[PDB]
Symmetry: D2
Subunit: 268 residues, 4 copies
């Protein structure tokens, strides 16, 4: 029936209805998956958003910078899905970089405290999540993370591109660990998407120039992409994550699957 | 329901029940795809082999080097699927390299006549097949080709590695043409599989040093791979082709997916 | 004392004074190298160009497609540099792709005959050259080839990009064969340069659309390049070839050195 | 004529005579470079070590984790080379990762505080150094960092690989900043060298398992290398850094140059 029919998947990262994790959770539910969701900080707002999903799914609090939340994760998840029952999928749609290391502040000027917070959330946490959830994962299982091609440097992205470079390395190692459990670990490298991750720069909140630079990136992304790129559509990226959570890419681990319209394969 | 339900797919490259294409065809038929099969040279024998598939499919002759075969291909494929109906998928599982450019023969002792023969069949033919079948493809279609990671040089593979490097470049350009049709173009880079592509070197036909060279590569592949690698199992590769033929990787084009157990992501 | 002082280098690829090879030859000679030059087709015309070099260097005929020129090459070089004397360096600055495979002809409309000729001259010839000169090369030696980054597809380059992909793979295997002689084999991936290789598309011989598209590429290259890119200055490329010909990159082989202003490291 | 005649070069990262930076400093001096050295913690040790170098050079103190050191560095460098004089080269041979992130400790057991210390010292400090030293750098200058290929996961290295992956990214953005000063920024990706960076794992201090892992890697590195690899000789690496500090690679920036024997270019 569904692509993930009878699968128990954990989906992290829903904040708004435009969050990549929301469309991942939506497509996953449409494809028969039973979900457990994790949210950070504004939990009464996340509960309101996740209520708009095709189905009821338990919401658990998880700050990946909180040692206690990580220590109790597996326990709280098992309680949510029933004892003796395990996870088949894990979705890491978590990331952040403070305004000093991303946007208009000069690259050099970002303090290591802010860069460190950014690497802990967007890169180190991918391993943190796998450490906590892998002992409650079933053989054949899948851990998918969200990436943004960091092989080439670009304007404004700055220390987020550095944190993504680190995430890619982490993923490669997580795969070594996950393989002992019969679990795959991969990243989906998406093109730009109009979520909370971009809303300040796009909305002219960092100035007119900053907004212009992103619009050139989104325009150029669409040009290069042989099959086009709609920065307003999160569903192609959502579908890709669901391909990796399914049993249809069973010899793929420690890798990057590009869901970007084909932009990264083209120069112009 | 089936992953490729209601999809019309052409599958090329079946020569034995062990061929990568045989597994792609069987898996696709299991997932409700209506196939058309192209075969080369020994067709009376290909029909005997294709009769072993889960369902009956039309068998057409196609020599990628015969221009009459290529020019008639769309018309002949149409005749088989019926007028008004178009293809939703194309599988290119065709490769060849003369003995002078592959195995024990010294890399410098390969006549260009033979390297050109190998590049025509292994690389150029991917653009030829796309040229012929793109006019009879439906928007959202998928063209998948078979790859063996040529990013690093290896013993024995020699000019076949060169042919594969040319192929990755062809794929990137086919994606550009295919995009105009709303069609995706990708390659599945597989790990070594015990087909007729490897039978001579493996069966000790190119001497001891050549067979030992392969064994070391083969062993190293399975140990590098975080989830392992089985040369005697084409099913994980076959599932990956089907994953790309499906609607679940809709933002991936001009790209390479690695169905290699994750081996290319590890040094040791 | 010069960077290539007392070195015997063979430099191929001079046709006009705008050629990359001419600049490689000028600088190498400026750096104390003893040269042996190889030209193709119109050698009386090439001799009138090589007369404009800082020093007198013997000129030898070499059509890379001519099986007799390669079989007799090493003998002609030894006769030119003196018996008992060996080459310390070799420069491959050869490339060609017919009008059907490059420019405004549809990528699909290139006949294999024409593609094969361009692959013979631009990739296979690098291996032909090394087969010929490795036996008359000194340990510590250096074979350098010219490349144009083929990792990402682009407009108008078409089958030349496919041949540059083939070349990259060929170099990797050449480094294997060369290492048995203590010789390094590498590619210098240069950005675009105003030579006879680009003069038609730059000059409008291919129409407005074509011209506009190459200008866009040039503009963007210099934009992306953190140190800038001047398509009218072959000197930084020549200097890079000389660096690989020296003993200053002694642990680098089967590789690509980018002399492109850093363009390939920047998305925009 | 020395390759670096009259070039005021800052060299960081000396601790012993086996340190990569010591050999970089030695060759730079052998090549007529005027040096300013930077040392950390054990400054009496570094002084005794630098006294063995070909010439007398000022040794300044720099802990990359200390903001006072970084802010004062530029003025202290000016004082050393002379008023009205700027640097022509800057060498970053600094790196560190605690035992929790490197060795036998499981990848999932490395606390973020430690991973963060490693990334601070190994990746972030490259930007810090450039931030401080670019305003006292001359046009045509070079910033060179030390790297160890992080594109593939491997045993033991774990989080240092994650840090190197981040360093590559930082270098790519440093090139964007340096380009404004007419300065190139690059990394030398070396193969493994018997320095203090490896001495614990090679010496058997992390047990048999860990020791055997390095043994396999070191042996594998030499067999993959077409020109070979000797981990007891840093001079080829040292030369390569000097090649990047010179005017012979003037079109290369935001890049990685592999002084690894060509090991990264071969699978076997
Ligand atoms: N939008 C894009 O252009 C784009 C492109 C490629 C990749 N991505 C990545 O996709 C992922 C999802 O981002 P998005 O674009 O949907 O933005 P988003 O802000 O909608 O989602 C990111 C999530 O990260 C969460 N988060 C932040 N700090 C956290 C902490 N300490 N603990 C737990 N969760 C925390 C936020 O609450 C939010 O739910 C991120 O990794 C992002 O880098 C985004
Ligand atoms: N098994 C491996 O080691 C391996 C690994 C990665 C990729 N591949 C690729 O997968 C594909 C399928 O190979 P396989 O491993 O199943 O072995 P195979 O020998 O069964 O497949 C090769 C196919 O190409 C066909 N062919 C050869 N010349 C042709 C021509 N002129 N016209 C039309 N068809 C022609 C053959 O008849 C055969 O069916 C090839 O492209 C191969 O390079 C193989
Ligand atoms: N100009 C650029 O933008 C650019 C960029 C990157 C790489 N390159 C490469 O540099 C190399 C030199 O090209 P160039 O830019 O100096 O232009 P060019 O056209 O002046 O030089 C190419 C040389 O290749 C020679 N050649 C062609 N067919 C031959 C054959 N059968 N045998 C022997 N020699 C033959 C030509 O006679 C010519 O001397 C080529 O490999 C080219 O692909 C050029
Ligand atoms: N030997 C290898 O296997 C290898 C391979 C590739 C790259 N490298 C790199 O080469 C560089 C030098 O390493 P090495 O092999 O010479 O070993 P090393 O231990 O001699 O060098 C590390 C240096 O970093 C300095 N350092 C450490 N912490 C610091 C801090 N907080 N502030 C300032 N300086 C600090 C020390 O003075 C020390 O000299 C490093 O970046 C290393 O990662 C080493
Ligand atoms: C609610 C207002 N949102 C913001 O401020 C967000 C939060 C933060 N995004 C993130 O962490 C973030 C970015 C990404 C994409 C890889 N994946 N993630 C989680 C930055 N940012 C912006 O808009 C931008 C400001 O400079 C930019 C430069 C490039 C792209 C976005 C912004
Ligand atoms: C039935 C007789 N088989 C053979 O001779 C086959 C046919 C031919 N393979 C092919 O073209 C071929 C190889 C591949 C894998 C990428 N994909 N394809 C179509 C060569 N080869 C061998 O075994 C080998 C001889 O050296 C080798 C070195 C490495 C691998 C195989 C052989
Ligand atoms: C003398 C008149 N010039 C030409 O016709 C040359 C000869 C031929 N170049 C070559 O083989 C050639 C090209 C390159 C660069 C990698 N390296 N090499 C030897 C094509 N070409 C052109 O201008 C172009 C026509 O479409 C183009 C698209 C892109 C770039 C150039 C042209
Ligand atoms: C003082 C005795 N040596 C040590 O303890 C050193 C110091 C520290 N290495 C470093 O920071 C370090 C390592 C490297 C190479 C990229 N570049 N750098 C700055 C760890 N380490 C070891 O030997 C190793 C322990 O597991 C290992 C696994 C692989 C390689 C070395 C060790």
């Amino acid at each position: 029936t569904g692509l993930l029919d009878g699968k128990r998947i954990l989906v992290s990262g829903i904040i708004t209805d435009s969050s990549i994790a929301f469309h991942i959770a939506r497509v996953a539910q449409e494809q028969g998956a039973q979900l457990v969701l994790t949210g950070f900080d504004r939990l009464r707002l996340i509960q309101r958003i996740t209520d708009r999903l095709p189905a009821k799914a338990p919401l658990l609090e998880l700050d990946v910078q909180n040692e206690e939340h990580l220590a109790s994760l597996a326990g709280r998840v098992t309680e949510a899905i029933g004892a003796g029952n395990k996870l088949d999928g894990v979705v890491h749609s978590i990331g952040f970089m403070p305004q000093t290391g991303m946007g208009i502040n000069p690259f050099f000027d970002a303090p290591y405290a802010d860069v460190s917070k950014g690497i802990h959330i967007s890169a180190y946490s991918y391993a943190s999540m796998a450490k906590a959830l892998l002992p409650i994962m079933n053989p054949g299982g899948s851990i998918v993370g969200m990436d943004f091609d960091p092989s080439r440097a670009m304007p404004a992205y700055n220390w987020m591109t550095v944190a993504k470079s680190a995430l890619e390395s982490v993923n490669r190692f997580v795969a070594r660990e996950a393989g002992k459990y019969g679990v795959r670990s991969n990243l989906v490298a998406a093109g730009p998407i109009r979520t909370l991750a971009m809303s300040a720069i796009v909305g002219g909140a960092l100035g007119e120039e900053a907004g212009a630079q992103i619009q050139l990136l989104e325009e150029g992304w669409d040009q290069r992409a042989p099959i086009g790129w709609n920065m307003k559509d999160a569903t192609p990226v959502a579908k890709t994550v669901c391909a990796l959570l399914s049993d249809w890419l069973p010899a793929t681990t420690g890798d990057i699957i590009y869901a970007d319209g084909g932009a990264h394969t083209q120069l112009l």
